[PDB]
Design a protein around this ligand. Structure first.
Ligand SMILES: [Cu+2]
Length: 370
């Protein structure tokens, strides 16, 4: 019970649904087809309900992690870019939109955490995790701290923990292995330890949450923090002089951030697959298209090479991409819930004393692979 003759698009209201609308006006002028951009409440939960009955929008915008499940249900259509088109985007973004060996979405935006710092308290940021401890002691002498970041959730703590070799699920030939998890190997143990030790020595507090960390860094009390593109505006208003850069290395290896990709999938029920493909590939994924959305509401870093080289003139953005090329693509499978649940607890119990690192990671590991 879907259109045929137009295009309805569901995008979250905190995104540039206006420039998306603008790009629509050009499509309409060139094709004569009208585009509609809507923002239903809690759309991530409605698409699944409505698409299961052959209804909903022709295109849905969202993080790629939810896309694996959608495909396990045959809700999306297998896109069809050719060799040439595929060479317009970064090789690693296509892996983020794969399933059982096949492509199912178009990478739009690329997100990943970064290290943020107060240029007035820290003229040059640390290239290593190993040196932070000594840096905090040097600042505490003046009534400041070195680092403060959300410690409640895996998104913020996984980068360190996995640098040495840990991981979510083994992957190599286009298929994941839900029985082979790496949160309990040597590397993952090495990283959690380093983190726990930071708290034990009072360089960090275990109850620090997103709000405290942001309030602290924006009042100008802490030299650094870790966060994404979505938090820059608050800082802009606070009157702090900040900078964004590459995350420190661990035991000589890069921090390994989870990589998130805003994607556009075609409803498998949609009678407008061609139009949708023409719109996404030749209107939205162009330097003019991505700019239109980025104006209304900034996107951060993108997957389109040509335009990424232009946005990358803002160090804040160049850093994001570099951190993404070193990170681990977020697995697009429903089992990632088991992972977030288990790891969030492991880190909390390990930071509270309730469990030692070796015990905490043994439980989660077994939990997930269960
Ligand atoms: Cu989600």
């Amino acid at each position: 019970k879907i259109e045929e003759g137009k295009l309805v698009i569901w995008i979250n209201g905190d995104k540039g649904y206006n420039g998306l609308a603008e790009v629509g006006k050009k499509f309409e002028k060139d094709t004569g087809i009208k585009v509609t951009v809507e923002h239903p409440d809690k759309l991530e939960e409605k698409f699944p309900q409505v698409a299961a009955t052959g209804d909903g929008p022709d295109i849905i915008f969202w993080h790629h992690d939810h896309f694996g499940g959608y495909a396990q249900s045959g809700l999306l259509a297998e896109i069809t870019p050719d060799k040439a088109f595929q060479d317009k985007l970064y090789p690693f973004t296509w892996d983020a939109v794969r399933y059982n060996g096949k492509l199912i979405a178009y990478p739009i935006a690329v997100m990943a955490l970064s290290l943020i710092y107060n240029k007035d308290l820290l003229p040059n940021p640390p290239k290593t995790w190993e040196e932070i401890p000594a840096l905090d002691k040097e600042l505490k002498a003046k009534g400041k701290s070195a680092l403060m970041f959300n410690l409640q959730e895996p998104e913020f703590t996984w980068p360190l923990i996995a640098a040495d070799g840990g991981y979510a699920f083994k992957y190599e030939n286009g298929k994941y292995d839900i029985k082979d998890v790496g949160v309990d190997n040597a590397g993952a143990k090495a990283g959690l330890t380093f983190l726990v030790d930071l708290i034990k020595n009072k360089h960090m507090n275990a109850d620090t949450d997103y709000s405290i960390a942001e309030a602290a860094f924006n009042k100008g009390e802490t030299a650094m923090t870790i966060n994404g593109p979505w938090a820059w505006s608050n800082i802009d208003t606070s009157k702090v002089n900040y900078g964004v850069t590459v995350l420190p290395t661990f035991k000589g290896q890069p921090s390994k951030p989870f990589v998130g990709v805003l994607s556009a999938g075609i409803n498998a029920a949609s009678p407008n697959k061609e139009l949708a493909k023409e719109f996404l590939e030749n209107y939205l994924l162009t330097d003019e298209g991505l700019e239109a959305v980025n104006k209304d509401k900034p996107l951060g870093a993108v997957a389109l090479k040509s335009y990424e080289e232009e946005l990358a003139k803002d160090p804040r953005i160049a850093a994001t991409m570099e951190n993404a090329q070193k990170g681990e693509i977020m697995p697009n499978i429903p089992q990632m819930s088991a992972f977030e649940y288990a790891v969030r607890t492991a880190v909390i119990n390990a930071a509270s004393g309730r469990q030692t690192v070796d015990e905490a990671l043994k439980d989660a590991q077994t939990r997930i692979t269960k």
